[model samples]
Target: MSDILQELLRVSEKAANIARACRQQETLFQLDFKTLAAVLVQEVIKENMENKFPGLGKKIFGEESNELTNDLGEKIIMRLGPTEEETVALLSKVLNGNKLASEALAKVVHQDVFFSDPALDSVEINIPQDILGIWVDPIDSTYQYIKGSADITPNQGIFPSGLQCVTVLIGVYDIQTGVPLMGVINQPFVSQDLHTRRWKGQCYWGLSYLGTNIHSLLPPVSVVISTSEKETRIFRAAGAGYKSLCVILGLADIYIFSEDTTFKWDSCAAHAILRAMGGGMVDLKECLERPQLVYHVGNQWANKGGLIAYRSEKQLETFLSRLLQH
Candidate 1:
């Protein structure tokens, strides 16, 4: 399990670097480059996993596509990686019309120390059967990511804060039980030195049963409950995974969102990470006493119902009281 965790971090970091670099080369004015970051990130992840850990291919899932494979040249071929059509669509933008570069990128294995020349071609680990469900959101906040950096001046549109909460998510889950056991949430925009603008991300990971290493989310004081009919502090941003991570990061106490918008890949990783740390996410339409986000066997991808995530059990209750009364 530790080896799997280590591999996840390595692969996830590679995905994040690809995502951030794609964004760095893009701006709002370049309409054609809008989806490049998300597409490139997913493609890079697929390439890395397939090249390095080809045996575990059957387990990999992502927002961009529904392909996977298993075994040696036998290719159990969950066929879930980006499809032929998706591949064609990708090289168009990612290769910038350079078919030769696309072919070259496909063959490279391990990245060099400087992240150039070639990434490694093999992984020194294997996955257990229970680790069958590893969900990946290469760039969680594609909407905000395309908008630009969080610190940048607000744009002239509805999602002015789009860059504020962009992220990447990887959740290890159980197929039979539909439960997440471990997770890694990386905030690609977070930095160490704000004095000088820099590009660095933070990884928050945990195993659901072993506990986590993260800042305490218990509020220092009782949360302020305004008497106003509606909580005016409403915030709109990118990615369900990123919003849920806010509770984990102590950036926000709750993420109340609707059912219609997000899918399973968006929230599963964060849900697994939170519960691993004594916190959780629940359906807003359901009771607070038994807050469970069930992932079904039949419908594996999309999720329904509104959601609310909090940092602790008590905080979940406190939130229920505040919202129910209002």
Candidate 2:
């Protein structure tokens, strides 16, 4: 793996770890969930990248970089970062002042020596030369992640209103062709089983453009629509990153979003990963050319119409046609 890609995954996992710490103490630290996960995770990713790789931070773009507003347009998490005291205060909440928590919190809060770096695997994807694409969705499904719980079993699949469907996404694309090359989607609340609850997390990644490139256990080449009603159930979650992940995970066959759907950062990572994983995400209009999402802002920001993702063209075409009929 290139040093930067390795670092990206490392930093991303650490950001996820930081978010997980907060989520572990979710009941006591309600405010953190309100904005802390997104805010804290965003800062870590940006800061870690800049600290480790000077020019890389500038190359990346994220939705969390901007502050969000409520219906009243009250600004949140964008004006200024947490004070040092606030950071430690949040650590207290995430750690709940336990022994292991104390050790973990101290290292993380101090930003000194923390978790050892894990080995990163090299994932080769085909892309245009001399161009690097970067995008991030620090936290998807903030509302659900804030007040989330499984309303149904995993086997039952995600209902339209399933909660706790949050995910963290980062994607890379070809700057020239606007084609996704590589990506990662990490689900912090993945269900191991109905009884296991959300004790475990799931991370899925992909690389593309390398024909017959066998990196790992790949999904089947030929795709089929999930016929089981439970498997085909539709659901909604905040992050476009994770929703696309549902198809990769086989939890649901497809995910759709409309109108104020998403920007490139939302789908960038998953788009790359899905294409790499033998699945794909595209514009709802069914453009003949594969759709490309814009990563820049200043109008033309939001994608028009809706979006749909599936494991294969047959699955996408048939399912989407029926989806539009009713």
For every candidate, C-alpha RMSD to the true structure in Å:
8.2, 6.4
Instruction: Please give each candidate's TM-score.
Output: 0.70, 0.70
Error of 2 at 137 (Å): 1.0
| Model 1 per-residue lDDT tens digits across residues 112-226 | 3222111212322333644467777877666567656555442221222545567788777777777776677777776534665456776766655333332212323254211
TM-score of 2: 0.70
Distance from true location, Cα of 68 in model 1, Å: 16
Please write out the lDDT profile of model 2 over residues 35-119, one tens digit for every residue. 5457656767776766786665666677764454444444544322244555454444443434444344434533532322232
Backbone clashes in candidate 2 total 1
Each model's number of backbone clashes? Answer: 15, 1
